């Protein structure tokens, strides 16, 4: 055949892949964690968005730390040979490097490690996307007026907020990040490369949202998502 | 708005 | 005029901007830190690469922690009104979230904070790029056979390695990451958007390099860089 | 400033330019030419489409051969310094290299010559687009089942049909070509380069249309437009 | 699988296709046609250029009008099922719509008709490219200081000059158009869509060449090629 | 349909 | 230069 | 090779 390029991930496998959505809204009373009002809006938006991208979506609600680990272990042990990629969305409370099960924390590394290039062979060389809507600390942004491959390769972590910062969620409209992500995927998934779509998400969250609170400490705050890429190729959700 |  | 889009940073200001290169090779004996053989190759490669991109390059060698902070404070206080962007390259020893001065550590947040949207007004809304060649821990990758805006917005952190991992540097050829970054910028800066160039860098580092060591603990190890983007627009080094 | 490229026409002048639409529907009885039913649909579609592209649209109906020449001469003598381009749409009867005034033919070369690089200095180096919906002969496509610059440079002729062939117009929906052109401009003018938009127009006309006639000679016929480019740069209707 | 687009021709068939180069340099004395000095440079340049694009190149020299027709008829009767496209380059004397065999003219339509969608079924729906270096008349450009598919669909005619004009050929360097075409294909075939490559060819010919002659009638003349597209999809010489 |  |  |  003619000249061939290897700049983009092969996304024309029989299946796009799984999209696991872990939606934690209600937490065990003993944890002292608040109910995440508006998260169901996020979960539904994500389910529809990824369904239209042809992903096999599996929604899971209110999972304990043990259930989260079991689920990810089981999913990583499935045969992903006929799948182009893997997507996991985590909606919960969190801290830097941590996501909360309904009864306690789970290190994000524990979850992502199941999908390492050496631990999930049927996903080796394929994009593994982790979308995380959770806090990464307690900082508030005041804003300003205007052969072998690495086992950590091929992962993309789309964090809702910058390292060390809180992440915002509206009880009626859903989280700022997920609202924006779904809107940009619906509008550009058939036109732009993934990093460019995520950059549009960054701009949307950065410019269209600002917190409103009766508490001065939490009022008029801003947010910027954080794209962390270990991808080795361009990612387009469409093919041909 | 609320924080996570 | 006709329809206008706002998807890419304005890079046609009178000047592209400053490119500060901090090259720490020799460390104070009391720190117990080794001399970073090969770093001069990196510094020279970067100087030439950014010179061709029309950046006003300033190379600084062997700076103490105090000198690094003073330098960044002073640079952030300059008038960047006529500049399109800002680039800072850090070549030194490091740990997660830390870069080493010749006499001790400096928190990366302390350095980047000087350039926050609210602290460096002449750079507000402009891309602030931090390229970091330094370790982020001690893990080794074994590989596998094959209106307002957020103050944290508009930053791009091009880390040489994944969170928690060592970063590799060849004493003769320079660091794997910087070698690759300069090669990709020279070949694609006039053709591709920055995130896409960095993705090519990820692939180059991930596929073309593997450590060779007489010590089994450090032998046959791999590396994957880590792109961390808080950018709100696409970044092209060329214009018109 | 940084590296600059000169691959696309400057389309950020104060004005996009003029869009002259010559809509000839009714012809002098002595010419023996039929009334072009459906052409008003085309004219209105074009007016709206180019209005949204920010062109100063001027619609002219039923012009004689003398009036067409006078109009083009006068327009070519205007000061186009503040305009990015020029567009002229001709809707009428025609033959190869000819367009019909209401009382007789006009050589297309006579019309386009007024805009030559040496005859219309304020348009030199700017794209001059001529969209032509008219026959170029009588052939029917049966289909098949599935420093200085040249004075002729910077012209683009978007012909509705291939050399020597009839061009189809539906009395209710308008011409196949204009219907398709307006649809593609509305959908892609803010996303694709002009030649690519015209290629989509070619596909739309080629695949979605087929004539229906009680006369076997004119039944089940197909059409393929013909893009003729003397452009020297890429043309995007949007800027920034 | 995931979402699929049909905007570009499938160019990943087992073979790119044939590239027939008809190089007519020496003409029968009785025709009164001059020897086309420099055409061998063009033929060699084309052979190498298309070889690198993975085309099965067949060079034919000094063919009579009868031999040209026989060759094209035979080639159109071959099985092109495993081929992605077809390319034919004609280097000879010519007039509008005509190319010269060594003993007389051949209508270009006669040649291209063999490849119509209904006459060459194994090429139906595939790009058929005809590159023509020949005069299209005697005009000189003085320049200015600065389901079914149509049987005519899927053809691209890359003419060296505008309708009605002479075409320039340098006895030492080869023709302006072919020199430029080969240079642009070598530099951009792995980066740009074909129409964009041809637009670069238009700019190169329009800006870098001007005739030098002791005869005032033929001195300081310019040339602009003419891209005629009936293509229905984007054409990239590379794939994957 | 009609021709022009 | 020469013409074709 | 060496680590940083």
PDB file of N, CA, C and O in Angstrom, chain A residues 155-196:
ATOM      1  N   UNK A 155      -2.250   6.487  29.317  1.00  0.00           N
ATOM      2  CA  UNK A 155      -3.268   6.879  30.290  1.00  0.00           C
ATOM      3  C   UNK A 155      -3.510   8.371  30.094  1.00  0.00           C
ATOM      4  O   UNK A 155      -2.590   9.123  29.759  1.00  0.00           O
ATOM      5  N   UNK A 156      -4.751   8.786  30.313  1.00  0.00           N
ATOM      6  CA  UNK A 156      -5.145  10.184  30.241  1.00  0.00           C
ATOM      7  C   UNK A 156      -6.028  10.392  31.459  1.00  0.00           C
ATOM      8  O   UNK A 156      -6.990   9.643  31.675  1.00  0.00           O
ATOM      9  N   UNK A 157      -5.669  11.373  32.278  1.00  0.00           N
ATOM     10  CA  UNK A 157      -6.437  11.684  33.469  1.00  0.00           C
ATOM     11  C   UNK A 157      -7.028  13.070  33.291  1.00  0.00           C
ATOM     12  O   UNK A 157      -6.294  14.056  33.238  1.00  0.00           O
ATOM     13  N   UNK A 158      -8.344  13.131  33.121  1.00  0.00           N
ATOM     14  CA  UNK A 158      -9.033  14.402  32.958  1.00  0.00           C
ATOM     15  C   UNK A 158      -9.599  14.800  34.317  1.00  0.00           C
ATOM     16  O   UNK A 158     -10.694  14.374  34.697  1.00  0.00           O
ATOM     17  N   UNK A 159      -8.803  15.551  35.072  1.00  0.00           N
ATOM     18  CA  UNK A 159      -9.207  16.015  36.398  1.00  0.00           C
ATOM     19  C   UNK A 159     -10.086  17.248  36.276  1.00  0.00           C
ATOM     20  O   UNK A 159      -9.833  18.133  35.459  1.00  0.00           O
ATOM     21  N   UNK A 160     -11.101  17.316  37.123  1.00  0.00           N
ATOM     22  CA  UNK A 160     -12.032  18.431  37.122  1.00  0.00           C
ATOM     23  C   UNK A 160     -11.433  19.729  37.647  1.00  0.00           C
ATOM     24  O   UNK A 160     -11.944  20.810  37.357  1.00  0.00           O
ATOM     25  N   UNK A 161     -10.350  19.615  38.409  1.00  0.00           N
ATOM     26  CA  UNK A 161      -9.741  20.782  39.020  1.00  0.00           C
ATOM     27  C   UNK A 161      -8.227  20.633  39.169  1.00  0.00           C
ATOM     28  O   UNK A 161      -7.683  19.534  39.040  1.00  0.00           O
ATOM     29  N   UNK A 162      -7.559  21.757  39.414  1.00  0.00           N
ATOM     30  CA  UNK A 162      -6.107  21.799  39.590  1.00  0.00           C
ATOM     31  C   UNK A 162      -5.672  21.119  40.892  1.00  0.00           C
ATOM     32  O   UNK A 162      -6.442  21.036  41.851  1.00  0.00           O
ATOM     33  N   UNK A 163      -4.424  20.620  40.940  1.00  0.00           N
ATOM     34  CA  UNK A 163      -3.912  19.954  42.142  1.00  0.00           C
ATOM     35  C   UNK A 163      -4.066  20.836  43.387  1.00  0.00           C
ATOM     36  O   UNK A 163      -3.759  22.027  43.343  1.00  0.00           O
ATOM     37  N   UNK A 164      -4.583  20.254  44.468  1.00  0.00           N
ATOM     38  CA  UNK A 164      -4.759  20.980  45.717  1.00  0.00           C
ATOM     39  C   UNK A 164      -6.030  21.794  45.883  1.00  0.00           C
ATOM     40  O   UNK A 164      -6.296  22.294  46.974  1.00  0.00           O
ATOM     41  N   UNK A 165      -6.844  21.873  44.835  1.00  0.00           N
ATOM     42  CA  UNK A 165      -8.067  22.668  44.872  1.00  0.00           C
ATOM     43  C   UNK A 165      -9.368  21.902  45.019  1.00  0.00           C
ATOM     44  O   UNK A 165      -9.458  20.716  44.691  1.00  0.00           O
ATOM     45  N   UNK A 166     -10.380  22.603  45.522  1.00  0.00           N
ATOM     46  CA  UNK A 166     -11.719  22.044  45.633  1.00  0.00           C
ATOM     47  C   UNK A 166     -12.231  21.964  44.195  1.00  0.00           C
ATOM     48  O   UNK A 166     -11.674  22.586  43.285  1.00  0.00           O
ATOM     49  N   UNK A 167     -13.305  21.208  44.005  1.00  0.00           N
ATOM     50  CA  UNK A 167     -13.947  21.095  42.705  1.00  0.00           C
ATOM     51  C   UNK A 167     -15.400  21.467  42.966  1.00  0.00           C
ATOM     52  O   UNK A 167     -15.986  21.030  43.959  1.00  0.00           O
ATOM     53  N   UNK A 168     -15.979  22.251  42.065  1.00  0.00           N
ATOM     54  CA  UNK A 168     -17.348  22.722  42.222  1.00  0.00           C
ATOM     55  C   UNK A 168     -18.440  21.907  41.541  1.00  0.00           C
ATOM     56  O   UNK A 168     -18.311  21.500  40.387  1.00  0.00           O
ATOM     57  N   UNK A 169     -19.544  21.732  42.260  1.00  0.00           N
ATOM     58  CA  UNK A 169     -20.705  20.986  41.784  1.00  0.00           C
ATOM     59  C   UNK A 169     -21.977  21.754  42.130  1.00  0.00           C
ATOM     60  O   UNK A 169     -22.184  22.136  43.281  1.00  0.00           O
ATOM     61  N   UNK A 170     -22.817  21.993  41.130  1.00  0.00           N
ATOM     62  CA  UNK A 170     -24.075  22.696  41.358  1.00  0.00           C
ATOM     63  C   UNK A 170     -25.166  21.651  41.613  1.00  0.00           C
ATOM     64  O   UNK A 170     -25.332  20.710  40.835  1.00  0.00           O
ATOM     65  N   UNK A 171     -25.905  21.820  42.706  1.00  0.00           N
ATOM     66  CA  UNK A 171     -26.951  20.873  43.083  1.00  0.00           C
ATOM     67  C   UNK A 171     -28.085  20.708  42.070  1.00  0.00           C
ATOM     68  O   UNK A 171     -28.752  19.673  42.047  1.00  0.00           O
ATOM     69  N   UNK A 172     -28.289  21.715  41.229  1.00  0.00           N
ATOM     70  CA  UNK A 172     -29.346  21.671  40.226  1.00  0.00           C
ATOM     71  C   UNK A 172     -28.860  21.311  38.823  1.00  0.00           C
ATOM     72  O   UNK A 172     -29.493  20.515  38.125  1.00  0.00           O
ATOM     73  N   UNK A 173     -27.718  21.871  38.427  1.00  0.00           N
ATOM     74  CA  UNK A 173     -27.171  21.656  37.088  1.00  0.00           C
ATOM     75  C   UNK A 173     -26.094  20.581  36.960  1.00  0.00           C
ATOM     76  O   UNK A 173     -25.765  20.164  35.849  1.00  0.00           O
ATOM     77  N   UNK A 174     -25.565  20.116  38.087  1.00  0.00           N
ATOM     78  CA  UNK A 174     -24.500  19.127  38.051  1.00  0.00           C
ATOM     79  C   UNK A 174     -23.159  19.828  38.194  1.00  0.00           C
ATOM     80  O   UNK A 174     -23.108  21.047  38.369  1.00  0.00           O
ATOM     81  N   UNK A 175     -22.067  19.077  38.116  1.00  0.00           N
ATOM     82  CA  UNK A 175     -20.750  19.693  38.267  1.00  0.00           C
ATOM     83  C   UNK A 175     -20.360  20.542  37.067  1.00  0.00           C
ATOM     84  O   UNK A 175     -20.730  20.249  35.929  1.00  0.00           O
ATOM     85  N   UNK A 176     -19.605  21.602  37.334  1.00  0.00           N
ATOM     86  CA  UNK A 176     -19.146  22.514  36.293  1.00  0.00           C
ATOM     87  C   UNK A 176     -18.359  21.760  35.224  1.00  0.00           C
ATOM     88  O   UNK A 176     -18.580  21.942  34.024  1.00  0.00           O
ATOM     89  N   UNK A 177     -17.452  20.901  35.675  1.00  0.00           N
ATOM     90  CA  UNK A 177     -16.602  20.127  34.782  1.00  0.00           C
ATOM     91  C   UNK A 177     -17.363  19.111  33.932  1.00  0.00           C
ATOM     92  O   UNK A 177     -17.200  19.082  32.716  1.00  0.00           O
ATOM     93  N   UNK A 178     -18.197  18.284  34.557  1.00  0.00           N
ATOM     94  CA  UNK A 178     -18.935  17.286  33.790  1.00  0.00           C
ATOM     95  C   UNK A 178     -19.929  17.931  32.822  1.00  0.00           C
ATOM     96  O   UNK A 178     -20.056  17.475  31.684  1.00  0.00           O
ATOM     97  N   UNK A 179     -20.598  19.002  33.253  1.00  0.00           N
ATOM     98  CA  UNK A 179     -21.537  19.726  32.386  1.00  0.00           C
ATOM     99  C   UNK A 179     -20.780  20.149  31.128  1.00  0.00           C
ATOM    100  O   UNK A 179     -21.227  19.930  30.002  1.00  0.00           O
ATOM    101  N   UNK A 180     -19.632  20.781  31.346  1.00  0.00           N
ATOM    102  CA  UNK A 180     -18.797  21.286  30.268  1.00  0.00           C
ATOM    103  C   UNK A 180     -18.214  20.190  29.382  1.00  0.00           C
ATOM    104  O   UNK A 180     -18.222  20.312  28.158  1.00  0.00           O
ATOM    105  N   UNK A 181     -17.735  19.116  30.000  1.00  0.00           N
ATOM    106  CA  UNK A 181     -17.159  17.995  29.265  1.00  0.00           C
ATOM    107  C   UNK A 181     -18.179  17.365  28.316  1.00  0.00           C
ATOM    108  O   UNK A 181     -17.886  17.129  27.142  1.00  0.00           O
ATOM    109  N   UNK A 182     -19.379  17.093  28.823  1.00  0.00           N
ATOM    110  CA  UNK A 182     -20.418  16.495  27.997  1.00  0.00           C
ATOM    111  C   UNK A 182     -20.821  17.417  26.857  1.00  0.00           C
ATOM    112  O   UNK A 182     -21.010  16.963  25.731  1.00  0.00           O
ATOM    113  N   UNK A 183     -20.926  18.713  27.141  1.00  0.00           N
ATOM    114  CA  UNK A 183     -21.293  19.684  26.115  1.00  0.00           C
ATOM    115  C   UNK A 183     -20.251  19.731  24.997  1.00  0.00           C
ATOM    116  O   UNK A 183     -20.601  19.758  23.816  1.00  0.00           O
ATOM    117  N   UNK A 184     -18.970  19.708  25.362  1.00  0.00           N
ATOM    118  CA  UNK A 184     -17.906  19.760  24.360  1.00  0.00           C
ATOM    119  C   UNK A 184     -17.768  18.466  23.568  1.00  0.00           C
ATOM    120  O   UNK A 184     -17.472  18.500  22.375  1.00  0.00           O
ATOM    121  N   UNK A 185     -18.019  17.329  24.211  1.00  0.00           N
ATOM    122  CA  UNK A 185     -17.954  16.049  23.509  1.00  0.00           C
ATOM    123  C   UNK A 185     -19.098  15.961  22.501  1.00  0.00           C
ATOM    124  O   UNK A 185     -18.905  15.537  21.363  1.00  0.00           O
ATOM    125  N   UNK A 186     -20.285  16.394  22.912  1.00  0.00           N
ATOM    126  CA  UNK A 186     -21.441  16.361  22.020  1.00  0.00           C
ATOM    127  C   UNK A 186     -21.235  17.250  20.798  1.00  0.00           C
ATOM    128  O   UNK A 186     -21.617  16.891  19.685  1.00  0.00           O
ATOM    129  N   UNK A 187     -20.593  18.395  20.998  1.00  0.00           N
ATOM    130  CA  UNK A 187     -20.368  19.326  19.903  1.00  0.00           C
ATOM    131  C   UNK A 187     -19.139  19.052  19.035  1.00  0.00           C
ATOM    132  O   UNK A 187     -19.186  19.265  17.821  1.00  0.00           O
ATOM    133  N   UNK A 188     -18.075  18.517  19.630  1.00  0.00           N
ATOM    134  CA  UNK A 188     -16.832  18.308  18.891  1.00  0.00           C
ATOM    135  C   UNK A 188     -16.245  16.908  18.727  1.00  0.00           C
ATOM    136  O   UNK A 188     -15.220  16.760  18.056  1.00  0.00           O
ATOM    137  N   UNK A 189     -16.865  15.885  19.308  1.00  0.00           N
ATOM    138  CA  UNK A 189     -16.330  14.523  19.200  1.00  0.00           C
ATOM    139  C   UNK A 189     -16.150  14.009  17.771  1.00  0.00           C
ATOM    140  O   UNK A 189     -15.331  13.124  17.525  1.00  0.00           O
ATOM    141  N   UNK A 190     -16.912  14.558  16.831  1.00  0.00           N
ATOM    142  CA  UNK A 190     -16.800  14.141  15.437  1.00  0.00           C
ATOM    143  C   UNK A 190     -15.965  15.123  14.612  1.00  0.00           C
ATOM    144  O   UNK A 190     -15.884  14.995  13.387  1.00  0.00           O
ATOM    145  N   UNK A 191     -15.301  16.063  15.288  1.00  0.00           N
ATOM    146  CA  UNK A 191     -14.506  17.086  14.605  1.00  0.00           C
ATOM    147  C   UNK A 191     -13.095  17.319  15.148  1.00  0.00           C
ATOM    148  O   UNK A 191     -12.181  17.623  14.381  1.00  0.00           O
ATOM    149  N   UNK A 192     -12.925  17.221  16.464  1.00  0.00           N
ATOM    150  CA  UNK A 192     -11.630  17.499  17.083  1.00  0.00           C
ATOM    151  C   UNK A 192     -10.953  16.359  17.827  1.00  0.00           C
ATOM    152  O   UNK A 192     -11.601  15.437  18.316  1.00  0.00           O
ATOM    153  N   UNK A 193      -9.631  16.466  17.935  1.00  0.00           N
ATOM    154  CA  UNK A 193      -8.820  15.495  18.659  1.00  0.00           C
ATOM    155  C   UNK A 193      -9.149  15.716  20.140  1.00  0.00           C
ATOM    156  O   UNK A 193      -9.458  16.839  20.553  1.00  0.00           O
ATOM    157  N   UNK A 194      -9.103  14.649  20.930  1.00  0.00           N
ATOM    158  CA  UNK A 194      -9.455  14.711  22.346  1.00  0.00           C
ATOM    159  C   UNK A 194      -8.797  15.807  23.190  1.00  0.00           C
ATOM    160  O   UNK A 194      -9.479  16.463  23.977  1.00  0.00           O
ATOM    161  N   UNK A 195      -7.489  16.015  23.047  1.00  0.00           N
ATOM    162  CA  UNK A 195      -6.821  17.054  23.830  1.00  0.00           C
ATOM    163  C   UNK A 195      -7.393  18.428  23.516  1.00  0.00           C
ATOM    164  O   UNK A 195      -7.489  19.286  24.392  1.00  0.00           O
ATOM    165  N   UNK A 196      -7.772  18.637  22.258  1.00  0.00           N
ATOM    166  CA  UNK A 196      -8.349  19.912  21.856  1.00  0.00           C
ATOM    167  C   UNK A 196      -9.757  20.080  22.425  1.00  0.00           C
ATOM    168  O   UNK A 196     -10.158  21.184  22.779  1.00  0.00           O
TER     169      UNK A 196
END
